[PDB]
Amino acid sequence: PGIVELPSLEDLKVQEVKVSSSVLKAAAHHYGAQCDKPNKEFMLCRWEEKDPRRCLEEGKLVNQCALEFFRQIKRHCAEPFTEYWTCIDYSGLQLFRRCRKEQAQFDKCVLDKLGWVRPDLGELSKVTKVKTDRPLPENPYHSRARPEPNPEVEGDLKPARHGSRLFFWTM
Amino acid sequence: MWFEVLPGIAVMGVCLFIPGMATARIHRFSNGGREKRVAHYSYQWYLMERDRRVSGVNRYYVSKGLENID
Ligand SMILES: CCCCCCCCCCCCCCCCCC(=O)OC[C@H](COP(=O)([O-])OC[C@H](O)COP(=O)([O-])OC[C@H](COC(=O)CCCCCCCCCCCCCCCCC)OC(=O)CCCCCCCCCCCCCCCCC)OC(=O)CCCCCCCCCCCCCCCCC
Numbered sequence: 001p002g003i004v005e006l007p008s009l010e011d012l013k014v015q016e017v018k019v020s021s022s023v024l025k026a027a028a029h030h031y032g033a034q035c036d037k038p039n040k041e042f043m044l045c046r047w048e049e050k051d052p053r054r055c056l057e058e059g060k061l062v063n064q065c066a067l068e069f070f071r072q073i074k075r076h077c078a079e080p081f082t083e084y085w086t087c088i089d090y091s092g093l094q095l096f097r098r099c100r101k102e103q104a105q106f107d108k109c110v111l112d113k114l115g116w117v118r119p120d121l122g123e124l125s126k127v128t129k130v131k132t133d134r135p136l137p138e139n140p141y142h143s144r145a146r147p148e149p150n151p152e153v154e155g156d157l158k159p160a161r162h163g164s165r166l167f168f169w170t171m
Numbered sequence: 172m173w174f175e176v177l178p179g180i181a182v183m184g185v186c187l188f189i190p191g192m193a194t195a196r197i198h199r200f201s202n203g204g205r206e207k208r209v210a211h212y213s214y215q216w217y218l219m220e221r222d223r224r225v226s227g228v229n230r231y232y233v234s235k236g237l238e239n240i241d
Pocket residue numbers: 168169170171
């Protein structure tokens with residue numbers, strides 16, 4: 001069959017978010033609140049196109065919007081964020097409940113210096129609507145033509161001509 | 172009297188104390204002064220392997236914070 005089309009290695013170069021998972025988990029709710037729109041544009045494009053190769057640029061926007069998220073933490077609130085993700089980082093399951101006072105200090109410093117409200121219980125799991133300018137994929141499965149069905153039954157049912165027609169039976 | 176049985180109970184209790192203290196201290200020694208990462212589910216293992224790749228030194232427990240970005 002045909003040749004698969006891989007993008008170049010230059011099309012895969014982006015400035016990586018080189019932080020650990022406890023840094024991401026400590027900043028997760030404010031990341032979902034602030035970096036909402038390009039993340040949801042990317043995931044809409046990702047569930048609609050069903051191809052990562054059709055989703056690179058929006059993905060780069062995700063990797064563009066995460067970094068601007070962290071710099072805006074790193075400029076203003078590096079101390080409560082560091083003290084909070086260290087405590088998140090201690091736990092082997094990375095519990096939020098072990099770290100509520102560092103969470104409260106990080107939320108206080110962020111709400112004072114940046115005005116970000118942490119999302120309540122239920123908010124980040126909502127199904128949201130996304131207004132994009134890319135087109136809807138008309139054939140996302142790349143399906144070819146389907147076979148035509150067999151012709152249906154039509155016409156009023158007349159009796160059997162001369163019955164069963166079984167060898168000598170007249171009905 | 173009944174406190175004559177307490178040396179054997181003390182020896183057996185120290186021997187029961189040893190494995191949990193040992194695994195706690197060995198987990199903190201082998202994982203950067205912290206608990207061992209618990210990966211029961213594939214998302215936790217995914218984040219753990221991401222940590223092992225973003226640390227640069229092939230160790231998930233080497234944490235990287237805001238200093239690793241500009
Ligand atoms: C106003 C509203 C009301 C109006 C009412 C109008 C009517 C008034 C009268 C009321 C009564 C009507 C009766 C039914 C209509 C006539 C049917 C008829 O004669 O068909 C002839 C039928 C076909 O001949 P035909 O000349 O081409 O057709 C004449 C008509 O057009 C036949 O018409 P058809 O072409 O439309 O027939 C359709 C088709 C015509 O047939 C075919 O297309 C060919 C296939 C027929 C079957 C062949 C099977 C062969 C292998 C098995 C053989 C078995 C052993 C033979 C018997 C051993 C002893 C029991 O029939 C069948 O396929 C059905 C099978 C045969 C049943 C006939 C009726 C039996 C009722 C009483 C049963 C009593 C026992 C009878 C003996 C048991 C065996 C039947 O003759 C045979 O098959 C030969 C065997 C005789 C059959 C039975 C005759 C009925 C009278 C029996 C009285 C004596 C009983 C003695 C005691 C018991 C036995 C010891």
